[PDB]
Amino acid sequence: PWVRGLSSRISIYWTIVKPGDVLVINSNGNLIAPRGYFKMRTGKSSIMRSDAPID
Amino acid sequence: AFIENGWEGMIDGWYGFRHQNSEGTGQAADLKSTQAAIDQINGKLNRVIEKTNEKFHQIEKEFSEVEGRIQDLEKYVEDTKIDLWSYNAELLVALENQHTIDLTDSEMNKLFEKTRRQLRENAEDMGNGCFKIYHKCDNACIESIRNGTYDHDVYRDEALNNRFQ
């Protein structure tokens, strides 16, 4: 359907790489390459949907 | 509720006494039984309302897009743990209010036992929570039973001549 003028979309799938593993990405089309990664830190953080302002 | 009525003018403690003799009337809060009751009351508060929180990463509990079985699984566990915490709230706080009436009855029973262990042959009960002292009791005699320093052998020969006579 017409979303923001365009009629095409992209599916997003993730892959977690452990320390000691090697990531191999081979494709023959429709491949989107990552430009980096993120650090999987361990903490007490979460997400929350809200509409209240910040004071 | 066999106390007929409390004391509205005593705002300096949860318990106390109301003396009445030839030197006038008045109310005085007991420093022993009131402080011994707040240690049992405030001990019930800080183990429930303080340091009972959980800091961890939760999951999404409200959804706008209905997916199917994956959302139907997490909805049944979330509605259970809300109702399980609500059932524990109806189990704890309703019993904490039930025990607090039993705690104030036990603190009154300990106050009746502390007064009863010093006024055996010296006084008798009246039926409304008051004790009928059968001897001369001035303001120093009131503070002796309030602080727990009352002597039974001193006022024994005076009150026994007017108790059964």
Add this chain to the structure above:
Amino acid sequence: AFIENGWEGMIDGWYGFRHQNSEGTGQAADLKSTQAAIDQINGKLNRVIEKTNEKFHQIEKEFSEVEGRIQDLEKYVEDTKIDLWSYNAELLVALENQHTIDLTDSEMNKLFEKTRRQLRENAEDMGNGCFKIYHKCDNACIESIRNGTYDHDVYRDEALNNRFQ
């Protein structure tokens, strides 16, 4: 259990008295202490057996086709909340039966306190839940302590001549 035995012939109340004087014997249920006990007993029932149900859409709990991890998650989910409700059933009803024996002991203690606050110099205990009245007590005297309208200063000069003599 220090009451030795109850009364099987009294089927018109949970509590009561058994009088014995020159005008005959008989049993009569106390209208004050029995009604004050059912308000505590039936108050425990309607907050548990009434208005404690949940009307909502549940999930499938029994399966014939074994799928795998999706069924293994809800199987450990369902078996926990059944055991959590069974543990809360062994926590509530076992304590409700424990408090009811303590309630009937407290209602007997309040009945012993209501009788004890009117029979200090007029009667004494016997050891089996009965009071030894040291004065003449007719059927109107039995109903005076039953309705709580007994007077201590009236029968004071009669029972004190036979209590310690």
Add this chain to the structure above:
Amino acid sequence: AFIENGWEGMIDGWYGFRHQNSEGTGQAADLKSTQAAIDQINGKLNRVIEKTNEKFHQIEKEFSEVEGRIQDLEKYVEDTKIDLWSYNAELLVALENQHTIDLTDSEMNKLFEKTRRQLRENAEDMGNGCFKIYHKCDNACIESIRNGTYDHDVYRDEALNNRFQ
């Protein structure tokens, strides 16, 4: 805590008596009130620590490979029932320790009632958990109140001549 201090030398029971007369002193454990208290104490243990285990196939609770939503559901499921069992552990064992102090107070109150129903006109309390016997009480008199075979009408004329005189 109105008992001032217990007895460290009495290691043959939870309760007992300490006699003192012309035939010497000593300590003796009560065979009635101690055994009646262990039936209430050990009855609380075997319904909690015994036959309360669940033998069933559980699921994987610790994971090394993070998959996503399938592991995020069971992580919030497992952390809830661990905290629910921990909250019930802070609800049961803290109330079982609270009731045990009330049980030992009630067993002392039943011991004070069993001694109080035999020493009305024969003895009086002292204030530290001891009774002041106003008559001659040998070692057979101590064992009569210990076994519950004490008679009130026998020592009535002897102790009443020294109680109020």
Add this chain to the structure above:
Amino acid sequence: EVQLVESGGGLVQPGGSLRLSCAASGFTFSTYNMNWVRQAPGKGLEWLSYISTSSNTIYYADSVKGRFTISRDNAKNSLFLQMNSLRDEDTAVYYCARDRGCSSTNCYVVGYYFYGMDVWGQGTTVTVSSASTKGPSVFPLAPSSKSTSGGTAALGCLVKDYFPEPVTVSWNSGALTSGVHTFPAVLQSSGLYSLSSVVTVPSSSLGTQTYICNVNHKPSNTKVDKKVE
């Protein structure tokens, strides 16, 4: 945070009248109990009075005998410690403390003073003396050789007949700080304080190094420098 600030101090004569203050902040003043505990020089702590939130239960010590008056106001959140019929024994540092109330960690229901006082203020110095402000009198001390094998010699300065305490005494305007010992002030027969300050120096620098004992007094603006030689 919870902090108690005292005020109303200063210098007074024996027989006057003052009114101390105990400013509270960070907590509700109308729910906690207050008291009055001082600290005598050379002695321990001494409780004086106690007041409640209802202002009906007021207690006093045996040494008070009605000579002091303690009040409070919920609209200003402070105390009113009236000091009447003072003497030389009452010259001490006064403090106001807040009672704990319960035996738990945080007392949501405030009780009484049966579980200590966990909040204490900074305090103010109240000096009760009839002597006025007087500048210090510096007296030097001539050193001499005492240790033969060690070769050391002590020297110092005597600060006597000054008022009030204290006096910041140093050497060479803070240049000589090693081995400098500061002695506390003691009461004399005239009521004025007196202390001293010495510095461990070798005997080889007696006739070479100049030792100037600097004495500076704040409220009298007296600066007397005497060379120790």
